[PDB]
Amino acid sequence: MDIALAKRVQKVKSPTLAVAAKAAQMKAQGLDIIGLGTGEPDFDTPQHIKLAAISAIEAGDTKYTAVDGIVELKEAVKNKFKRDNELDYQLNQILVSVGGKQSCYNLCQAYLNPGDEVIIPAPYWVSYPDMVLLADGVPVIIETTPAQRYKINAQQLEQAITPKTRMIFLNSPSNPSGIAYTQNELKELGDVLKKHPQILIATDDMYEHIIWSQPFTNILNACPELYDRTIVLNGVSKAYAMTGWRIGYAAGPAPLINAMKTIQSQSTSNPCSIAQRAAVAALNGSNESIEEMVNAFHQRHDYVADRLQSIDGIEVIPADGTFYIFPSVQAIIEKRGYANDIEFSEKLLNEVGVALVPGSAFGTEGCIRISFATGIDTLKDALNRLQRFCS
Amino acid sequence: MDIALAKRVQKVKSPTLAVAAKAAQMKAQGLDIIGLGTGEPDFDTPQHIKLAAISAIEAGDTKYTAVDGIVELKEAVKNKFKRDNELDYQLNQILVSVGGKQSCYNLCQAYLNPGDEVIIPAPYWVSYPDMVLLADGVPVIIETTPAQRYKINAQQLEQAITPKTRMIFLNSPSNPSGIAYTQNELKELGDVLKKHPQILIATDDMYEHIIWSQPFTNILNACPELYDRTIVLNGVSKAYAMTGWRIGYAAGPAPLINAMKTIQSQSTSNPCSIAQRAAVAALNGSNESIEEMVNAFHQRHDYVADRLQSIDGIEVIPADGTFYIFPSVQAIIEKRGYANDIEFSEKLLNEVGVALVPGSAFGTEGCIRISFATGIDTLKDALNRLQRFCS
Numbered sequence A, B: 001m002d003i004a005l006a007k008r009v010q011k012v013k014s015p016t017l018a019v020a021a022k023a024a025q026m027k028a029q030g031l032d033i034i035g036l037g038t039g040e041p042d043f044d045t046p047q048h049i050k051l052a053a054i055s056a057i058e059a060g061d062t063k064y065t066a067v068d069g070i071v072e073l074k075e076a077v078k079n080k081f082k083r084d085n086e087l088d089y090q091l092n093q094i095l096v097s098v099g100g101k102q103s104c105y106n107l108c109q110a111y112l113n114p115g116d117e118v119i120i121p122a123p124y125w126v127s128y129p130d131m132v133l134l135a136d137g138v139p140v141i142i143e144t145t146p147a148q149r150y151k152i153n154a155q156q157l158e159q160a161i162t163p164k165t166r167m168i169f170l171n172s173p174s175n176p177s178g179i180a181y182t183q184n185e186l187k188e189l190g191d192v193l194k195k196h197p198q199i200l201i202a203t204d205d206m207y208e209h210i211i212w213s214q215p216f217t218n219i220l221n222a223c224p225e226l227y228d229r230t231i232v233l234n235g236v237s238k239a240y241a242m243t244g245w246r247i248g249y250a251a252g253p254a255p256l257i258n259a260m261k262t263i264q265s266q267s268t269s270n271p272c273s274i275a276q277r278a279a280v281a282a283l284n285g286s287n288e289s290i291e292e293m294v295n296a297f298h299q300r301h302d303y304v305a306d307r308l309q310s311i312d313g314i315e316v317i318p319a320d321g322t323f324y325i326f327p328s329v330q331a332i333i334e335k336r337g338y339a340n341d342i343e344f345s346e347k348l349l350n351e352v353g354v355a356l357v358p359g360s361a362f363g364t365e366g367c368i369r370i371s372f373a374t375g376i377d378t379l380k381d382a383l384n385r386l387q388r389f390c391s
């Protein structure tokens, strides 16, 4: 007999890591593949962070640590939230985790009960619904359009809330759209959320530093009165090109943070001790390397957006930040008679070798997520191929 | 209003990491504290493993990897299981995780349904019941005595099994007793397990290399016919003094391993990329550093066991391996009128500064777990203090 799988894992299907595995596979066969599906910076970890990790290895920092992070890193997080976000957190409000993904997963396991509804704006990071489902929560998707710049409004939010709603993910700047809410937009959402006090607000600020159209702002900057029911989710993966090291961090209400620490203490223990020391050097160091990387993404974005605009049948909303852009190819799908954006993306990959992620993976049919965390020369080639495929 | 906690997290209370935090705290106040509660080797990570990690950092191995491990590490695990354990696994049967704790936690989340019973022999590693409870499983504890050398027998196992039993943890050599089953003992347990085919066998071989009284053997060496319903859990934390790096690995039935990979893909993504490269160097390198460390634990064990034997009111069963020994202080508790082994351990810490873990944390009242992952000079001091306290 085959080993049966738990009912909870039968609820879930990760297509971003799956495209990555298919792209690596077809490159392994020797084919001419350009990967526009990546979810990490192409830049290496900055040298001063690498040097701090090497110093930690040489010093023998190879042991278990406090589950929620060495005190130097919890302090660096505390100071970062004050310095960058004008938010005051005590050490017992801070949890360092194995990537920001684990912050989110620990949150769901520490907080959500079976049947609880979680508002997830589309387009959404692929993992939000699956993490909710693994806690037996119920994803409640709010669909958005380009005319709304892929952002929910206060009337959509109120309409989606029920007496069963206990959480919302607010991810700004967004994976996959690259769009960020303005402070006033967050204020209008906060005014709705103030009317529903059982809703915990999970603000996923992972892409905070990767923004150029406006200064970063989150729900607590807009609505300080929501502090006691908000958890702030962040990490070093994107700002410091540290995706492989797996360090995220969160700040929020002490009882919730302690419950998340309890989940973590029974699942991973502390994150890698060397990675923790690397993250101290990142958070306490200069922003110079951040600015270098964000400037690169900005110039690449403007190039890609211009190329997409010029391709007949592709409609695009320019991003505010991140290394993603999220154009609609629905007109190409319709003129070709493709079934959907999965067929579009499979045909594109097999015809011209460009790998990207179908918009339906993020809950928005007919779009595609293009990542420009690759060199501008590779982007010129890839957009040439996309233009030829769509011609 | 305080943020409420999920019902699942209200089910759980980690006391090994808690003693560690209290010991570090009292040392911080400047007090004369000896920590005999540690759960990791005192030796640093071997130099050749450190050098491989540094080489990976310098090479820019700082990106996301396959969630279940880079192919070089999955291959090293495959070869390790064949070389050490005469077990044949394909790559799709292997999962690298964030510590062996995450292997165990992923297993529970991928496999256990609410109400499923899990047999957990006492004394048990503190995390087994809590990981089961977080999947809404039901821990079913089998209590053992020193006259049984803290090992279950086939009649106890059969009596504990019900139609609801779907899993058993078999941890040999044991945390906290240090005792290992013989091959024939595992054969007798396997004969019971063959009569109950819905029971998945989770053999936690983390302490495999840290053994001296007999060659290591597990349930599949004893009973090869259980291969299709056994998951083998192991890791580099103990054998290579790598606890801070967080690399575990497991091998078992492909559908189950894939479901565990699904949980991992929605919780942590891949383990730290640098740590994965370090683990490749460990598994593919010489056993010389393992033997050096295990020889040290062996000589320290024999010293500690002899000192414990000489203290009136302490009864001890010598360990077969690990860096733990698990004597009973019940006679001290009774002559003093202490309430239990928690009171014993608190009084010992406050009177003479020796920190250790009460046996009730592992489900065996009246014992204490002493770790000898510290230098022999510190052990002489600590045992002197214990002798004075117990006098």
Ligand SMILES: Cc1ncc(COP(=O)(O)O)c(C=O)c1O
Pocket (backbone or CB within 6 Å): A039, A098, A099, A100, A101, A102, A125, A171, A174, A175, A204, A206, A235, A236, A237, A243, A246, A247, A248, B268, B269
């Ligand atoms: C919106 C969002 N949140 C969180 C994460 C988690 O990233 P990591 O687990 O590498 O910290 C990601 C992925 O990069 C993301 O896109």
Ligand SMILES: Cc1ncc(COP(=O)(O)O)c(C=O)c1O
Pocket (backbone or CB within 6 Å): A268, A269, B039, B098, B099, B100, B101, B102, B125, B171, B174, B175, B204, B206, B235, B236, B237, B243, B246, B247, B248
């Ligand atoms: C019995 C047992 N299994 C698994 C583990 C997991 O160790 P780690 O998560 O560091 O790999 C431990 C702790 O060291 C343990 O004692």
